[PDB]
Amino acid sequence: TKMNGCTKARQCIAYKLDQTKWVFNSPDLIRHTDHSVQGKLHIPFRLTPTV
Amino acid sequence: AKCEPSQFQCTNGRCITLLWKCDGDEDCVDGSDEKNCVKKTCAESDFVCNNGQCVPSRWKCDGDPDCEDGSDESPEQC
Ligand SMILES: [Ca+2]
Ligand SMILES: [Ca+2]
């Protein structure tokens, strides 16, 4: 799509829509504007007492 | 401004390191991070258009021309 008024590729940005599995909040992933918690995953390997 | 690399300081005041000059991540307002330096213009993901131009390999044989010689979409390529 021809973009009006543009001269440099850094003047615009585009990204695909994806949500197949939600993302773990991580310092490397920018958040979506709706950063509400979409779900919760059970952290595996419970620490349990044992002898 | 004061910088540590002391190389190719662009008008934005950022010293363009020689690697940064070919880093492919254009940083300064001027497209100064892709000028006057040695680089593999195509990576393993990228297509060599016939005149020596380099572009995303996906653009090859897509029904819609892209690089300036048309090599990504010349019927000879598809
Ligand atoms: Ca750069
Ligand atoms: Ca194409």
mmCIF file of N, CA and C and ligand atoms in Angstrom:
data_model
loop_
_atom_site.group_PDB
_atom_site.id
_atom_site.type_symbol
_atom_site.label_atom_id
_atom_site.label_comp_id
_atom_site.label_asym_id
_atom_site.label_seq_id
_atom_site.Cartn_x
_atom_site.Cartn_y
_atom_site.Cartn_z
ATOM 1 N N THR A 1 0.825 -1.199 0.000
ATOM 2 C CA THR A 1 0.000 0.000 0.000
ATOM 3 C C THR A 1 0.861 1.252 0.000
ATOM 4 N N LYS A 2 0.704 2.074 -1.035
ATOM 5 C CA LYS A 2 1.395 3.354 -1.091
ATOM 6 C C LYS A 2 0.973 4.222 0.086
ATOM 7 N N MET A 3 1.953 4.739 0.817
ATOM 8 C CA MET A 3 1.687 5.586 1.969
ATOM 9 C C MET A 3 1.935 7.038 1.593
ATOM 10 N N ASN A 4 0.942 7.880 1.843
ATOM 11 C CA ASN A 4 1.010 9.280 1.453
ATOM 12 C C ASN A 4 1.952 10.079 2.344
ATOM 13 N N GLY A 5 2.645 11.043 1.736
ATOM 14 C CA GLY A 5 3.536 11.941 2.442
ATOM 15 C C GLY A 5 4.817 11.345 2.980
ATOM 16 N N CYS A 6 5.071 10.064 2.762
ATOM 17 C CA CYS A 6 6.236 9.423 3.349
ATOM 18 C C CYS A 6 7.470 9.508 2.462
ATOM 19 N N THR A 7 8.633 9.492 3.112
ATOM 20 C CA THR A 7 9.924 9.557 2.439
ATOM 21 C C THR A 7 10.942 8.562 2.970
ATOM 22 N N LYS A 8 10.805 8.094 4.206
ATOM 23 C CA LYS A 8 11.733 7.146 4.800
ATOM 24 C C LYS A 8 10.955 6.001 5.425
ATOM 25 N N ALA A 9 11.500 4.791 5.303
ATOM 26 C CA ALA A 9 10.819 3.619 5.836
ATOM 27 C C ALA A 9 10.697 3.658 7.348
ATOM 28 N N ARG A 10 11.522 4.444 8.029
ATOM 29 C CA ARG A 10 11.401 4.536 9.473
ATOM 30 C C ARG A 10 10.283 5.469 9.901
ATOM 31 N N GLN A 11 9.701 6.220 8.968
ATOM 32 C CA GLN A 11 8.591 7.092 9.311
ATOM 33 C C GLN A 11 7.302 6.324 9.556
ATOM 34 N N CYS A 12 7.232 5.061 9.136
ATOM 35 C CA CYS A 12 6.051 4.233 9.319
ATOM 36 C C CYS A 12 6.423 2.914 9.972
ATOM 37 N N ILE A 13 5.400 2.241 10.491
ATOM 38 C CA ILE A 13 5.563 0.944 11.129
ATOM 39 C C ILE A 13 4.302 0.133 10.871
ATOM 40 N N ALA A 14 4.460 -1.188 10.796
ATOM 41 C CA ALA A 14 3.324 -2.079 10.613
ATOM 42 C C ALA A 14 3.621 -3.420 11.262
ATOM 43 N N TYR A 15 2.581 -4.040 11.815
ATOM 44 C CA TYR A 15 2.725 -5.291 12.542
ATOM 45 C C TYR A 15 1.508 -6.170 12.303
ATOM 46 N N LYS A 16 1.745 -7.476 12.275
ATOM 47 C CA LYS A 16 0.686 -8.452 12.077
ATOM 48 C C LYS A 16 -0.089 -8.697 13.366
ATOM 49 N N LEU A 17 -1.350 -9.088 13.208
ATOM 50 C CA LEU A 17 -2.197 -9.460 14.336
ATOM 51 C C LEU A 17 -1.928 -10.902 14.748
ATOM 52 N N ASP A 18 -1.634 -11.116 16.028
ATOM 53 C CA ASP A 18 -1.397 -12.466 16.515
ATOM 54 C C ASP A 18 -1.745 -12.564 17.992
ATOM 55 N N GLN A 19 -2.370 -13.694 18.369
ATOM 56 C CA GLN A 19 -2.700 -13.974 19.763
ATOM 57 C C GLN A 19 -2.758 -15.472 20.046
ATOM 58 N N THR A 20 -2.228 -16.323 19.158
ATOM 59 C CA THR A 20 -2.406 -17.776 19.239
ATOM 60 C C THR A 20 -2.186 -18.333 20.642
ATOM 61 N N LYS A 21 -1.193 -17.816 21.354
ATOM 62 C CA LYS A 21 -1.032 -18.059 22.782
ATOM 63 C C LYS A 21 -0.496 -16.781 23.391
ATOM 64 N N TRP A 22 -1.082 -16.373 24.511
ATOM 65 C CA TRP A 22 -0.676 -15.128 25.134
ATOM 66 C C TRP A 22 0.802 -15.171 25.493
ATOM 67 N N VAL A 23 1.347 -13.999 25.752
ATOM 68 C CA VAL A 23 2.766 -13.836 26.020
ATOM 69 C C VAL A 23 3.039 -13.604 27.494
ATOM 70 N N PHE A 24 4.066 -14.276 28.001
ATOM 71 C CA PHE A 24 4.543 -14.027 29.350
ATOM 72 C C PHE A 24 5.069 -12.606 29.410
ATOM 73 N N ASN A 25 4.588 -11.817 30.370
ATOM 74 C CA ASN A 25 5.147 -10.480 30.502
ATOM 75 C C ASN A 25 6.643 -10.612 30.716
ATOM 76 N N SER A 26 7.403 -9.929 29.876
ATOM 77 C CA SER A 26 8.843 -10.086 29.881
ATOM 78 C C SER A 26 9.485 -8.761 29.544
ATOM 79 N N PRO A 27 10.643 -8.468 30.124
ATOM 80 C CA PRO A 27 11.306 -7.199 29.820
ATOM 81 C C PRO A 27 11.617 -7.016 28.353
ATOM 82 N N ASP A 28 11.625 -8.076 27.553
ATOM 83 C CA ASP A 28 11.913 -7.898 26.141
ATOM 84 C C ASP A 28 10.670 -7.669 25.287
ATOM 85 N N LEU A 29 9.477 -7.895 25.806
ATOM 86 C CA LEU A 29 8.275 -7.729 25.003
ATOM 87 C C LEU A 29 7.555 -6.453 25.401
ATOM 88 N N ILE A 30 7.368 -5.551 24.438
ATOM 89 C CA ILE A 30 6.570 -4.363 24.697
ATOM 90 C C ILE A 30 5.129 -4.790 24.940
ATOM 91 N N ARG A 31 4.462 -4.136 25.883
ATOM 92 C CA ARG A 31 3.088 -4.510 26.178
ATOM 93 C C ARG A 31 2.115 -3.925 25.168
ATOM 94 N N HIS A 32 0.990 -4.608 25.009
ATOM 95 C CA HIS A 32 -0.126 -4.055 24.268
ATOM 96 C C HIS A 32 -0.767 -2.960 25.109
ATOM 97 N N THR A 33 -1.528 -2.080 24.459
ATOM 98 C CA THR A 33 -2.194 -1.034 25.227
ATOM 99 C C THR A 33 -3.158 -1.624 26.246
ATOM 100 N N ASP A 34 -3.811 -2.737 25.914
ATOM 101 C CA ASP A 34 -4.662 -3.443 26.867
ATOM 102 C C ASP A 34 -3.792 -4.485 27.561
ATOM 103 N N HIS A 35 -3.031 -4.030 28.548
ATOM 104 C CA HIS A 35 -2.151 -4.927 29.278
ATOM 105 C C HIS A 35 -2.859 -5.653 30.410
ATOM 106 N N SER A 36 -4.186 -5.710 30.384
ATOM 107 C CA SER A 36 -4.908 -6.462 31.396
ATOM 108 C C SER A 36 -4.549 -7.936 31.294
ATOM 109 N N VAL A 37 -4.449 -8.594 32.444
ATOM 110 C CA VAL A 37 -4.053 -9.995 32.477
ATOM 111 C C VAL A 37 -5.058 -10.849 31.720
ATOM 112 N N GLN A 38 -4.634 -11.403 30.586
ATOM 113 C CA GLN A 38 -5.520 -12.212 29.763
ATOM 114 C C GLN A 38 -5.686 -13.626 30.294
ATOM 115 N N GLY A 39 -4.776 -14.087 31.141
ATOM 116 C CA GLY A 39 -4.884 -15.424 31.691
ATOM 117 C C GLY A 39 -3.757 -15.678 32.662
ATOM 118 N N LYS A 40 -3.825 -16.839 33.307
ATOM 119 C CA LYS A 40 -2.827 -17.248 34.284
ATOM 120 C C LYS A 40 -2.410 -18.687 34.028
ATOM 121 N N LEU A 41 -1.105 -18.943 34.050
ATOM 122 C CA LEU A 41 -0.563 -20.277 33.831
ATOM 123 C C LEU A 41 0.039 -20.796 35.124
ATOM 124 N N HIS A 42 -0.259 -22.044 35.453
ATOM 125 C CA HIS A 42 0.286 -22.665 36.652
ATOM 126 C C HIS A 42 1.772 -22.946 36.480
ATOM 127 N N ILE A 43 2.581 -22.334 37.335
ATOM 128 C CA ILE A 43 4.023 -22.546 37.346
ATOM 129 C C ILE A 43 4.270 -23.990 37.755
ATOM 130 N N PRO A 44 4.921 -24.786 36.924
ATOM 131 C CA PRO A 44 5.152 -26.190 37.257
ATOM 132 C C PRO A 44 6.252 -26.378 38.292
ATOM 133 N N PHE A 45 6.311 -27.610 38.789
ATOM 134 C CA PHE A 45 7.294 -28.091 39.752
ATOM 135 C C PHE A 45 7.181 -27.440 41.122
ATOM 136 N N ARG A 46 6.039 -27.635 41.774
ATOM 137 C CA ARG A 46 5.831 -27.136 43.125
ATOM 138 C C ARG A 46 6.933 -27.608 44.055
ATOM 139 N N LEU A 47 7.448 -26.701 44.866
ATOM 140 C CA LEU A 47 8.377 -27.126 45.893
ATOM 141 C C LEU A 47 7.575 -27.833 46.972
ATOM 142 N N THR A 48 7.985 -29.040 47.347
ATOM 143 C CA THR A 48 7.254 -29.766 48.373
ATOM 144 C C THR A 48 8.209 -30.391 49.373
ATOM 145 N N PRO A 49 7.783 -30.529 50.624
ATOM 146 C CA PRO A 49 8.619 -31.199 51.618
ATOM 147 C C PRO A 49 8.819 -32.663 51.273
ATOM 148 N N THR A 50 9.969 -33.186 51.682
ATOM 149 C CA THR A 50 10.349 -34.564 51.412
ATOM 150 C C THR A 50 11.498 -34.878 52.361
ATOM 151 N N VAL A 51 11.806 -36.158 52.548
ATOM 152 C CA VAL A 51 12.944 -36.576 53.356
ATOM 153 C C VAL A 51 14.162 -36.833 52.484
ATOM 154 N N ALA B 1 28.385 16.489 20.288
ATOM 155 C CA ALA B 1 28.351 16.069 21.684
ATOM 156 C C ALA B 1 29.445 15.050 21.966
ATOM 157 N N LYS B 2 29.749 14.857 23.246
ATOM 158 C CA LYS B 2 30.758 13.885 23.635
ATOM 159 C C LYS B 2 30.213 12.477 23.422
ATOM 160 N N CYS B 3 31.017 11.622 22.796
ATOM 161 C CA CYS B 3 30.675 10.223 22.603
ATOM 162 C C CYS B 3 31.932 9.385 22.769
ATOM 163 N N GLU B 4 31.732 8.088 22.967
ATOM 164 C CA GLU B 4 32.848 7.161 23.112
ATOM 165 C C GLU B 4 33.360 6.597 21.785
ATOM 166 N N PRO B 5 32.499 6.212 20.830
ATOM 167 C CA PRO B 5 33.037 5.676 19.568
ATOM 168 C C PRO B 5 33.784 6.700 18.731
ATOM 169 N N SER B 6 33.428 7.981 18.829
ATOM 170 C CA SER B 6 34.089 9.054 18.078
ATOM 171 C C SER B 6 34.110 8.796 16.571
ATOM 172 N N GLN B 7 33.078 8.140 16.041
ATOM 173 C CA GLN B 7 33.028 7.814 14.621
ATOM 174 C C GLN B 7 31.731 8.322 14.005
ATOM 175 N N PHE B 8 31.840 8.875 12.792
ATOM 176 C CA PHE B 8 30.722 9.335 11.965
ATOM 177 C C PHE B 8 29.551 9.926 12.751
ATOM 178 N N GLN B 9 29.823 10.924 13.591
ATOM 179 C CA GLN B 9 28.779 11.568 14.380
ATOM 180 C C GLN B 9 27.761 12.249 13.474
ATOM 181 N N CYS B 10 26.537 11.730 13.456
ATOM 182 C CA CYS B 10 25.482 12.273 12.615
ATOM 183 C C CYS B 10 24.963 13.598 13.170
ATOM 184 N N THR B 11 24.076 14.223 12.391
ATOM 185 C CA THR B 11 23.468 15.487 12.788
ATOM 186 C C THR B 11 22.639 15.368 14.058
ATOM 187 N N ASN B 12 22.141 14.174 14.380
ATOM 188 C CA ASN B 12 21.442 13.965 15.643
ATOM 189 C C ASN B 12 22.389 13.939 16.835
ATOM 190 N N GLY B 13 23.696 14.006 16.598
ATOM 191 C CA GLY B 13 24.674 13.993 17.661
ATOM 192 C C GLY B 13 25.159 12.631 18.100
ATOM 193 N N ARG B 14 24.792 11.562 17.399
ATOM 194 C CA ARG B 14 25.215 10.217 17.768
ATOM 195 C C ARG B 14 26.343 9.768 16.852
ATOM 196 N N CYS B 15 27.461 9.388 17.459
ATOM 197 C CA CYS B 15 28.613 8.861 16.739
ATOM 198 C C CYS B 15 28.249 7.516 16.128
ATOM 199 N N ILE B 16 28.175 7.462 14.799
ATOM 200 C CA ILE B 16 27.882 6.215 14.097
ATOM 201 C C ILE B 16 29.150 5.364 14.052
ATOM 202 N N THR B 17 29.203 4.331 14.897
ATOM 203 C CA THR B 17 30.298 3.369 14.859
ATOM 204 C C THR B 17 30.398 2.780 13.456
ATOM 205 N N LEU B 18 31.618 2.418 13.044
ATOM 206 C CA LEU B 18 31.793 1.839 11.715
ATOM 207 C C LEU B 18 30.886 0.631 11.510
ATOM 208 N N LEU B 19 30.773 -0.232 12.522
ATOM 209 C CA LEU B 19 29.814 -1.330 12.445
ATOM 210 C C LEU B 19 28.389 -0.797 12.345
ATOM 211 N N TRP B 20 28.032 0.146 13.228
ATOM 212 C CA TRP B 20 26.710 0.765 13.180
ATOM 213 C C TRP B 20 26.438 1.361 11.811
ATOM 214 N N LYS B 21 27.481 1.875 11.159
ATOM 215 C CA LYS B 21 27.361 2.418 9.814
ATOM 216 C C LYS B 21 26.883 1.358 8.832
ATOM 217 N N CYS B 22 27.028 0.079 9.193
ATOM 218 C CA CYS B 22 26.583 -1.062 8.401
ATOM 219 C C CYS B 22 25.770 -2.040 9.243
ATOM 220 N N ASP B 23 25.198 -1.574 10.355
ATOM 221 C CA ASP B 23 24.460 -2.448 11.258
ATOM 222 C C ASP B 23 23.097 -2.837 10.699
ATOM 223 N N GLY B 24 22.590 -2.082 9.727
ATOM 224 C CA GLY B 24 21.290 -2.314 9.140
ATOM 225 C C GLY B 24 20.134 -1.760 9.935
ATOM 226 N N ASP B 25 20.371 -1.324 11.166
ATOM 227 C CA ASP B 25 19.357 -0.684 11.998
ATOM 228 C C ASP B 25 19.586 0.820 11.902
ATOM 229 N N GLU B 26 18.971 1.452 10.904
ATOM 230 C CA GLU B 26 19.182 2.880 10.713
ATOM 231 C C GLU B 26 18.746 3.605 11.972
ATOM 232 N N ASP B 27 19.687 4.305 12.593
ATOM 233 C CA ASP B 27 19.482 4.907 13.900
ATOM 234 C C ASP B 27 19.300 6.414 13.842
ATOM 235 N N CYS B 28 20.244 7.123 13.238
ATOM 236 C CA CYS B 28 20.142 8.564 13.123
ATOM 237 C C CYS B 28 18.997 8.938 12.185
ATOM 238 N N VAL B 29 18.574 10.201 12.266
ATOM 239 C CA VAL B 29 17.508 10.684 11.391
ATOM 240 C C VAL B 29 17.899 10.497 9.931
ATOM 241 N N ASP B 30 19.139 10.826 9.592
ATOM 242 C CA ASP B 30 19.687 10.514 8.283
ATOM 243 C C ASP B 30 20.014 9.029 8.206
ATOM 244 N N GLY B 31 19.703 8.422 7.065
ATOM 245 C CA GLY B 31 20.007 7.023 6.833
ATOM 246 C C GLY B 31 21.498 6.773 6.759
ATOM 247 N N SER B 32 22.185 7.120 7.844
ATOM 248 C CA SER B 32 23.635 7.096 7.946
ATOM 249 C C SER B 32 24.185 5.773 8.465
ATOM 250 N N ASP B 33 23.330 4.876 8.945
ATOM 251 C CA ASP B 33 23.749 3.554 9.394
ATOM 252 C C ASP B 33 23.744 2.519 8.277
ATOM 253 N N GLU B 34 23.612 2.951 7.024
ATOM 254 C CA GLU B 34 23.652 2.078 5.852
ATOM 255 C C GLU B 34 24.426 2.746 4.719
ATOM 256 N N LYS B 35 25.496 3.469 5.049
ATOM 257 C CA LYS B 35 26.259 4.203 4.047
ATOM 258 C C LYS B 35 27.767 4.021 4.162
ATOM 259 N N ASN B 36 28.404 3.903 2.998
ATOM 260 C CA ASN B 36 29.861 3.898 2.838
ATOM 261 C C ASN B 36 30.600 2.895 3.726
ATOM 262 N N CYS B 37 30.165 1.638 3.693
ATOM 263 C CA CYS B 37 30.869 0.618 4.459
ATOM 264 C C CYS B 37 30.567 -0.752 3.871
ATOM 265 N N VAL B 38 31.436 -1.702 4.199
ATOM 266 C CA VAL B 38 31.322 -3.078 3.726
ATOM 267 C C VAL B 38 30.257 -3.824 4.520
ATOM 268 N N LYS B 39 29.347 -4.489 3.810
ATOM 269 C CA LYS B 39 28.335 -5.314 4.456
ATOM 270 C C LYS B 39 27.851 -6.385 3.491
ATOM 271 N N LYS B 40 27.448 -7.523 4.052
ATOM 272 C CA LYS B 40 26.719 -8.540 3.301
ATOM 273 C C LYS B 40 25.322 -7.993 3.064
ATOM 274 N N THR B 41 25.109 -7.360 1.915
ATOM 275 C CA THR B 41 23.847 -6.669 1.590
ATOM 276 C C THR B 41 22.630 -7.596 1.640
ATOM 277 N N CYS B 42 22.816 -8.891 1.367
ATOM 278 C CA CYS B 42 21.836 -9.952 1.587
ATOM 279 C C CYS B 42 22.304 -10.933 2.678
ATOM 280 N N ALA B 43 21.446 -11.190 3.667
ATOM 281 C CA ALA B 43 21.622 -12.230 4.663
ATOM 282 C C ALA B 43 21.031 -13.528 4.115
ATOM 283 N N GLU B 44 21.070 -14.593 4.917
ATOM 284 C CA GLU B 44 20.533 -15.866 4.449
ATOM 285 C C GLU B 44 19.033 -15.791 4.185
ATOM 286 N N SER B 45 18.358 -14.798 4.749
ATOM 287 C CA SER B 45 16.941 -14.548 4.534
ATOM 288 C C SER B 45 16.650 -13.623 3.356
ATOM 289 N N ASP B 46 17.633 -13.137 2.602
ATOM 290 C CA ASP B 46 17.443 -12.005 1.682
ATOM 291 C C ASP B 46 17.754 -12.377 0.224
ATOM 292 N N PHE B 47 17.073 -11.740 -0.733
ATOM 293 C CA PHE B 47 17.203 -12.041 -2.162
ATOM 294 C C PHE B 47 18.036 -11.001 -2.919
ATOM 295 N N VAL B 48 19.039 -11.490 -3.654
ATOM 296 C CA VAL B 48 19.863 -10.725 -4.591
ATOM 297 C C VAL B 48 19.115 -10.473 -5.908
ATOM 298 N N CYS B 49 18.465 -9.315 -6.025
ATOM 299 C CA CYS B 49 17.964 -8.821 -7.307
ATOM 300 C C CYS B 49 19.122 -8.645 -8.320
ATOM 301 N N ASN B 50 18.859 -8.872 -9.613
ATOM 302 C CA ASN B 50 19.889 -9.065 -10.646
ATOM 303 C C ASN B 50 20.935 -7.935 -10.741
ATOM 304 N N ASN B 51 20.558 -6.673 -10.532
ATOM 305 C CA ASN B 51 21.480 -5.529 -10.540
ATOM 306 C C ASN B 51 22.389 -5.409 -9.290
ATOM 307 N N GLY B 52 22.256 -6.297 -8.301
ATOM 308 C CA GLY B 52 22.990 -6.252 -7.031
ATOM 309 C C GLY B 52 22.200 -5.655 -5.858
ATOM 310 N N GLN B 53 20.950 -5.229 -6.070
ATOM 311 C CA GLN B 53 20.037 -4.805 -5.002
ATOM 312 C C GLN B 53 19.625 -5.979 -4.096
ATOM 313 N N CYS B 54 19.385 -5.714 -2.811
ATOM 314 C CA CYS B 54 18.997 -6.725 -1.820
ATOM 315 C C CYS B 54 17.708 -6.360 -1.078
ATOM 316 N N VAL B 55 16.800 -7.330 -0.962
ATOM 317 C CA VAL B 55 15.429 -7.151 -0.453
ATOM 318 C C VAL B 55 14.918 -8.417 0.250
ATOM 319 N N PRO B 56 13.827 -8.354 1.040
ATOM 320 C CA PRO B 56 13.276 -9.554 1.682
ATOM 321 C C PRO B 56 12.958 -10.649 0.676
ATOM 322 N N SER B 57 13.493 -11.845 0.935
ATOM 323 C CA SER B 57 13.334 -12.968 0.015
ATOM 324 C C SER B 57 11.871 -13.288 -0.259
ATOM 325 N N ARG B 58 10.988 -13.040 0.709
ATOM 326 C CA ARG B 58 9.566 -13.292 0.496
ATOM 327 C C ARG B 58 9.023 -12.503 -0.684
ATOM 328 N N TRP B 59 9.577 -11.329 -0.977
ATOM 329 C CA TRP B 59 9.130 -10.512 -2.103
ATOM 330 C C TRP B 59 9.360 -11.194 -3.455
ATOM 331 N N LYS B 60 10.264 -12.183 -3.535
ATOM 332 C CA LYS B 60 10.487 -12.894 -4.788
ATOM 333 C C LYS B 60 9.254 -13.675 -5.225
ATOM 334 N N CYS B 61 8.800 -13.567 -6.470
ATOM 335 C CA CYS B 61 7.743 -14.418 -7.041
ATOM 336 C C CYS B 61 6.446 -14.431 -6.210
ATOM 337 N N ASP B 62 5.887 -13.250 -5.968
ATOM 338 C CA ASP B 62 4.708 -12.990 -5.133
ATOM 339 C C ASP B 62 3.524 -12.381 -5.915
ATOM 340 N N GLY B 63 3.679 -12.148 -7.220
ATOM 341 C CA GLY B 63 2.697 -11.465 -8.061
ATOM 342 C C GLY B 63 2.702 -9.929 -7.958
ATOM 343 N N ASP B 64 3.700 -9.300 -7.325
ATOM 344 C CA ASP B 64 3.682 -7.872 -7.004
ATOM 345 C C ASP B 64 5.104 -7.268 -6.910
ATOM 346 N N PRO B 65 5.636 -6.576 -7.935
ATOM 347 C CA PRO B 65 7.057 -6.204 -8.013
ATOM 348 C C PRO B 65 7.537 -5.193 -6.968
ATOM 349 N N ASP B 66 8.813 -5.293 -6.570
ATOM 350 C CA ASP B 66 9.368 -4.576 -5.417
ATOM 351 C C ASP B 66 10.724 -3.878 -5.620
ATOM 352 N N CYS B 67 11.791 -4.596 -5.979
ATOM 353 C CA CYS B 67 13.127 -4.014 -6.160
ATOM 354 C C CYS B 67 13.221 -3.233 -7.485
ATOM 355 N N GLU B 68 14.130 -2.264 -7.579
ATOM 356 C CA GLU B 68 14.085 -1.224 -8.619
ATOM 357 C C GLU B 68 14.358 -1.706 -10.056
ATOM 358 N N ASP B 69 15.029 -2.845 -10.246
ATOM 359 C CA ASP B 69 15.172 -3.500 -11.557
ATOM 360 C C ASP B 69 14.039 -4.500 -11.866
ATOM 361 N N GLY B 70 13.099 -4.688 -10.937
ATOM 362 C CA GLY B 70 11.999 -5.645 -11.031
ATOM 363 C C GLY B 70 12.404 -7.115 -10.863
ATOM 364 N N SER B 71 13.659 -7.423 -10.532
ATOM 365 C CA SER B 71 14.176 -8.799 -10.512
ATOM 366 C C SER B 71 13.413 -9.744 -9.572
ATOM 367 N N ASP B 72 12.855 -9.247 -8.460
ATOM 368 C CA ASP B 72 12.027 -10.053 -7.553
ATOM 369 C C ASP B 72 10.758 -10.604 -8.225
ATOM 370 N N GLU B 73 10.344 -10.054 -9.359
ATOM 371 C CA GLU B 73 9.056 -10.340 -9.989
ATOM 372 C C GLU B 73 9.131 -10.401 -11.522
ATOM 373 N N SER B 74 10.339 -10.424 -12.081
ATOM 374 C CA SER B 74 10.546 -10.803 -13.473
ATOM 375 C C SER B 74 10.125 -12.272 -13.672
ATOM 376 N N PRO B 75 9.322 -12.613 -14.696
ATOM 377 C CA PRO B 75 8.932 -13.997 -15.007
ATOM 378 C C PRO B 75 10.120 -14.928 -15.209
ATOM 379 N N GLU B 76 11.278 -14.369 -15.569
ATOM 380 C CA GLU B 76 12.476 -15.188 -15.699
ATOM 381 C C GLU B 76 12.896 -15.758 -14.352
ATOM 382 N N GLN B 77 12.607 -15.056 -13.250
ATOM 383 C CA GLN B 77 12.894 -15.501 -11.886
ATOM 384 C C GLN B 77 11.831 -16.487 -11.370
ATOM 385 N N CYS B 78 10.644 -16.573 -12.001
ATOM 386 C CA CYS B 78 9.560 -17.401 -11.495
ATOM 387 C C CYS B 78 9.187 -18.491 -12.496
HETATM 388 CA CA CA C 1 22.644 1.857 12.398
HETATM 389 CA CA CA C 2 7.477 -9.008 -5.419
#
